[PDB]
C-alpha cells in the first residue's frame, strides 16, 4: 500500500524539486515524511466530516483541513 | 552510445520544471490515502476532488521539502541528498522535534 | 447598484452581505464594503495583468494555472503575499542550483 | 439545482479591463476566485481584531484601509489604499 | 478601574494541585496569557466549524471538536472527557 | 447552588466565558453547554501545566512558581511542547541542551 | 537629539551571550554584522505593525499591548505582557 | 581554547536574564521607529516586550545557525549557516 509511491515517482517529484542525485535510503524516509503529513491533513479533513454527520469526506473538508495546517490550497472551492 | 553520468538528471529537471501535471500515479495514491482513513473511520467515501486536492497540496509539499533537502544537501559540499538532509530541514522547519 | 455609483466592477452589495454574515463585528459601516471590494478588485487586476502577460510569453490565449504561478512567484510582491499558498497544477519556476551544472 | 454563488463574472469583467483579447480556463477560475475569498477572509478578520483592540463595535473603511496597510507588502499596500480611498470618495460623491 | 483576570481561579486550581506553593507576578501574568491564546484558539475554531456547516449557534459539540482539531492526543482526550463530564453535570444540576 | 461553576463542579466562571464568547463576535448565538465545556477545557489545561510547574518549582526548592518553571514545564512536556510551539515565555529561557 | 548607528550598540559581547544561550561554540567574525542585519529586519517588521495598531488607536505613545499584538501578527505570540 | 565557550554556554542556559543591554537597544527601537514615523513615544513595558521578543527570536536562530554549522562537519557558525537557517524557515 504505501510503498506503492513508487521510488520512480519519488525521484520524478524530486527531479521536480531540483534535485540531480539521489540516495537509496531517500525513497523510505520520503515514504515515511508523506505518511505523517497525509495523516495530520486527512485526520483533520476526517474531524470536520464528523462534525459535518457525513460518511463522504468532501473537498471543503480537505481545503479547510490543509488552512488548519498552514497549507493553504487554491482550485477547489477555497 | 552512452550519456554522461548527471546529464539525464539535468534534462529531466528541465522537463519536469517545465510542466505542472501530477508525478504519483493516481491510483496507488489514492488506495493510500484510502487505508490512511480507515484508522480514523470506517466506512469512509471520498469525492473525487477531494482526493485530488489532497494529491497536489501532498505533491507541492514534497517538492519544496525537496528544495531544501537540495539546499541542505548543497551546503554541506554535497550533491545527492541523503536522509540526514530531510531531517535537518524538516527540524529547521518546525514539523519534525 | 453601488458598483457604479464607485466606478468599481467587482459587487458591493456582496460584500457588504458576507461583511455582515461573516460576524466580524456587531455592526457594518457604509464605507467598509466600497473600500474592501475597491481593493479586491485591484488585487485581481494585478494578477490578471501579471498572468496574462505570462500567458502571452508562453503564447497562449486562455489563461491556465501554470500562467498563474508563474506571474505571482515571478513576482516579488505577489509571492510575499501568497507565501502559503500552493495553487493546484501550478508547478514551480524554473531553477537549477550552479553546483549541478556541468562542468 | 442548488444556486451557488462565485465572483466569476467580475473576474472577467476586470480580465477584459486589463487585457481585453484575452480569456481563462475554468480551473484557473477557481483559483482566482478561491484568492479572492482567501484575501476577503484575511483583511476582514484583521479588521475585526482591529475592532475588539480598540474597543469598538463597527468596521469601517478606515479598519479595512488599517488591515489592508498590516496586511499587504509595502508598494502592493500602497496601490492597495489608493484605489480603495478613491472608491470610497467617488461613492460618497454619487447617490 | 477593573482590569478583569483568571487570578482567583489559578490560584485556585493552583491550591487544589499544589496547596503549598505560590505564583510571581509574571508568572501569574503567563499564565492568564496562555488562558485568553487557548480560549481565542478554540473559540476561532468552533466559530469556523459554525460557519462551515452553515450554523448561526456555536454548541458544545463545535467546543468539542474544535478541541479534537487544536489539542494534541493525550491532551485532548483528557480536556475531552473533562468538558463532557462537565456539560452532564451542569445539565443534572 | 446560584453560580453556574458550581452546577458544573468547576473553579472557573462560566458566566465570564459566555460573556467573552457572546462579546467576540464568533457567531450570532451561543449554546449554553459550550461555556461550561469551554471553561472545563480552560481548566484542566491550567490544572495540567500548574501540576510540571509546581514540581519544576520544587526541583529548584522554591515556594513560589516563576516563569523559568513555566518554561522547563511545557518545553519538557511533549504535547505541551507542541501546543505552545509558537509561543514565546518572558523570562522563559531555554531548556539546558549542548 | 538625532539618532545615528545605533545599530552597533548591539556590541559584540552582546550578540556572543546570544549565541551561547543558543548552543553556539565557536563563532565566525562575519557573523555579527549578519546578526545585527536580521535583527535590524526582525525589529522593522514588528515596530512596522506596531506603529500601525498605534495609529489606528489615534495615539502618540506606543503601548505593550502594540508590541502583543504584532508579535501575533508575525506567528510569534508573547506571554507574559498581556493580551 | 573551547573550555570557557562551554562553561559560557551552561551559564547562559541555566539563567533567564537578558542578555543584550537595555539602553543601547532602547535606542536603536527608537530610531528604527522614528524611521517609519516621527514623534513616538514608548511605554518601557512595551520596549521590553520587544526585547523579549528579539531575544528569543535570537536564540531560536542560533539554534537553528548551530544545526546547520553541525550539518557541514564544521564547528564555527558562519553567515551562510545564518542565510540557509532563514531561507529554510521561509523567511526573507
Same mark, same amino acid.
Request: glycine letters at 6%; aromatic letters at 6%; charged letters at 25%.
Given at each position: ?65 490543509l ?12 | ?6 546529464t ?42 477531494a ?47 | ?18 461583511? *455582515?454574515?461573516?460576524?466580524y @463585528?456587531? +455592526? ?7 473600500? !474592501?471590494?475597491? %481593493? ?25 494555472? *501554470?500562467?498563474?504561478?508563474? @506571474?505571482? +512567484? ?7 503575499? !501568497?507565501?502559503? %499558498?500552493?495553487?493546484?497544477?501550478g ?13 | ?40 477572509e ?13 474597543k ?14 498590516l ?23 454619487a447617490?
Amino acid at each position: 500500500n504505501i510503498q506503492g509511491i513508487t521510488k520512480p515517482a519519488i525521484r520524478r517529484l524530486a527531479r521536480r524539486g531540483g534535485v540531480k542525485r539521489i540516495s537509496g535510503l531517500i525513497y523510505e524516509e520520503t515514504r515515511g515524511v508523506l505518511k505523517v503529513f497525509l495523516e495530520n491533513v486527512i485526520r483533520d479533513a476526517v474531524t470536520y466530516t464528523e462534525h459535518a454527520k457525513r460518511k463522504t469526506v468532501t473537498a471543503m473538508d480537505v481545503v479547510y483541513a490543509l488552512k488548519r495546517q498552514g497549507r493553504t490550497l487554491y482550485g477547489f472551492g477555497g | 552510445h552512452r550519456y554522461r553520468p548527471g546529464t539525464v538528471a539535468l534534462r529531466e529537471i528541465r522537463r519536469y520544471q517545465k510542466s505542472t501535471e501530477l508525478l504519483i500515479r493516481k491510483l496507488p495514491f489514492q488506495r493510500l490515502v484510502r487505508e490512511i482513513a480507515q484508522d480514523f473511520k470506517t466506512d469512509l467515501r471520498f469525492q473525487s476532488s477531494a482526493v485530488m486536492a489532497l494529491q497536489e497540496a501532498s505533491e507541492a509539499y514534497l517538492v519544496a521539502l525537496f528544495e531544501d533537502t537540495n539546499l541542505c544537501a548543497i551546503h554541506a559540499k554535497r550533491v545527492t541528498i541523503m536522509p540526514k538532509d530531510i531531517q535537518l530541514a524538516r527540524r529547521i522547519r518546525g514539523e519534525r522535534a | 447598484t453601488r458598483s457604479s455609483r464607485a466606478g468599481l466592477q467587482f459587487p458591493v452589495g456582496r460584500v457588504h452581505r458576507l461583511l *455582515r454574515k461573516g460576524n466580524y @463585528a456587531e +455592526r457594518v459601516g457604509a464605507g467598509a464594503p466600497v473600500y !474592501l471590494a475597491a %481593493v479586491l478588485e485591484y488585487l485581481t487586476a494585478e494578477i490578471l495583468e501579471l498572468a496574462g502577460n505570462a500567458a502571452r510569453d508562453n503564447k497562449k490565449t486562455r489563461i491556465i494555472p *501554470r500562467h498563474l504561478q508563474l @506571474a505571482v +512567484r515571478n513576482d516579488e510582491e505577489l509571492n510575499k503575499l !501568497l507565501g502559503r %499558498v500552493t495553487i493546484a497544477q501550478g508547478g514551480v519556476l524554473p531553477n537549477i542550483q550552479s553546483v549541478l551544472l556541468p562542468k | 439545482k442548488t444556486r451557488k454563488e462565485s465572483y466569476a463574472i467580475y473576474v472577467y469583467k476586470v480580465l477584459k479591463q486589463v487585457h481585453p483579447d484575452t480569456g481563462i480556463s475554468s480551473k484557473a477560475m477557481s483559483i482566482m476566485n478561491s484568492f479572492v475569498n482567501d484575501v476577503f477572509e484575511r483583511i476582514a478578520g484583521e479588521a475585526s481584531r482591529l475592532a475588539h483592540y480598540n474597543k469598538r463595535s463597527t468596521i469601517t473603511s478606515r479598519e479595512i484601509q488599517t488591515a489592508v496597510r498590516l496586511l499587504l507588502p509595502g508598494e502592493l499596500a500602497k496601490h492597495a489604499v489608493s484605489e480603495g480611498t478613491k472608491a470610497v470618495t467617488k461613492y460618497t460623491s454619487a447617490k
